[PDB]
Write a protein that binds this ligand. Structure first.
Ligand SMILES: NC[C@H](c1ccc(Cl)cc1)c1ccc(-c2cn[nH]c2)cc1
Lengths: 20, 337
């Protein structure tokens, strides 16, 4: 499921802003 | 009349924009209690103002680290904007000041914690719950955009819950006062408009795209474009495809199709009728906008209260010293702060 793929991903924690 | 409130708000803002408040307190006036979050060039602390006993959130920026990260102009934007603005769902800048080592911004403390924390734990929000928060963002952007401000970092990580269960938008590190286009590649990967990814000049429309992502993520429990690496996410965002969970209502799907629209001429919020396309959408039909502004409508969730300086809705971080060098760092760079 899409939920399970998200929860297994490395991007469920606080996400950093991008920059240079 | 929205128009009249906004005209008056712009008069209030410009006065403070053209003559920004400066050096309105000092470190020793505050008791430092706990770190509420920590990151690259700065952290945020719960502090107590000793002369009043009021609790505030104090953001501390290491001037040398801001320089290294090329965030000087963006940091001066943050403070100049925050001291000038005034809106119920923005965190009020009460004081600002600097010393040899650091920049300080003292804001109202929101004891309910980050939307991020609650969204992740609960898994997802019901559509009414999500709609309640979304309305407050819709009004905040209406306010900010009327002042020619672009916000540029909407996400659950940057939305605080107050004691009454209403939102405070915080983190104005990338906020900018621009009439026309701007080009900076900034924001958070999941939330970037196609424009930004494709190095186009862009405008406030990127904020309304970011609203679409937020609403989706609030209602689904995960964002519309995710992957393990940023590049994979950007490929999804530019593709022009989005799947909605079967539980998404017809109206929700339709709001999001119009918000997450790669075509600027069709993106809601960016059309001839402006923000009212959003405000008058069927999904918001139950929304009483004035009642939301007056914070008269009941929160679908009210945080656990345990005193004035309770930090239990925030995570724990290692406490690190606030050290003040005997030598002034980066004096010229931050002269106007
Ligand atoms: N991104 C919000 C920032 C923060 C949170 C967590 C981490 Cl790890 C780093 C930075 C933050 C900003 C403002 C406030 C706050 C709370 N009440 N008033 C302001 C808390 C956290």
């Amino acid at each position: 499921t899409t939920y399970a793929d998200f929860i297994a991903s490395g991007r469920t924690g606080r996400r950093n802003a991008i920059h240079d | 009349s929205v128009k009249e409130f906004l005209a008056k708000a712009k008069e209030d803002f410009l006065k403070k924009w053209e003559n920004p408040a400066q050096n309105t307190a000092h470190l020793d006036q505050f008791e430092r209690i706990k770190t509420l979050g920590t990151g690259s060039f700065g952290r945020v602390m719960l502090v107590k103002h000793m002369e009043t006993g009021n609790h505030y959130a104090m953001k501390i920026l290491d001037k040398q680290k801001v320089v290294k990260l090329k965030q000087i102009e963006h940091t001066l934007n943050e403070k100049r904007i925050l001291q000038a603005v005034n809106f119920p769902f923005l965190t009020k800048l009460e004081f600002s000041f600097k010393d040899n080592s650091n920049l300080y911004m003292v804001m109202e403390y929101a004891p309910g914690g980050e939307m991020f924390s609650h969204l992740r734990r609960i898994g997802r929000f019901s559509e009414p719950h999500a709609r309640f928060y979304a309305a407050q963002i819709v009004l905040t952007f209406e306010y900010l955009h009327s002042l020619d401000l672009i916000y540029r970092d909407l996400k659950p990580e940057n939305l605080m819950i107050d004691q009454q269960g209403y939102i405070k938008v915080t983190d104005f590190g990338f906020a900018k006062r621009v009439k026309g286009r701007t080009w900076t590649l900034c924001g958070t990967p999941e939330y970037l408009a196609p424009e930004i990814i494709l190095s186009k000049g862009y405008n406030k429309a990127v904020d309304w795209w970011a609203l679409g992502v937020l609403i989706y993520e609030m209602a689904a429990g995960y964002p519309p474009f995710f992957a393990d690496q940023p590049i994979q996410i950007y490929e999804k965002i530019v593709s022009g495809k989005v799947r909605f969970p079967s539980h998404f209502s017809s109206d929700l799907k339709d709001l999001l199709r119009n918000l997450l629209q790669v075509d600027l001429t069709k993106r809601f919020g960016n059309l001839k009728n402006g923000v009212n396309d959003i405000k008058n959408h069927k999904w918001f039909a139950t929304t009483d906008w004035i009642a939301i502004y007056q914070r008269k409508v009941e929160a679908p969730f009210i945080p656990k209260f345990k005193g004035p300086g309770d930090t239990s809705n925030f995570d724990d971080y290692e406490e690190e010293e606030i050290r003040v060098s005997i030598n002034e760092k980066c004096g010229k760079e931050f002269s106007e702060f």
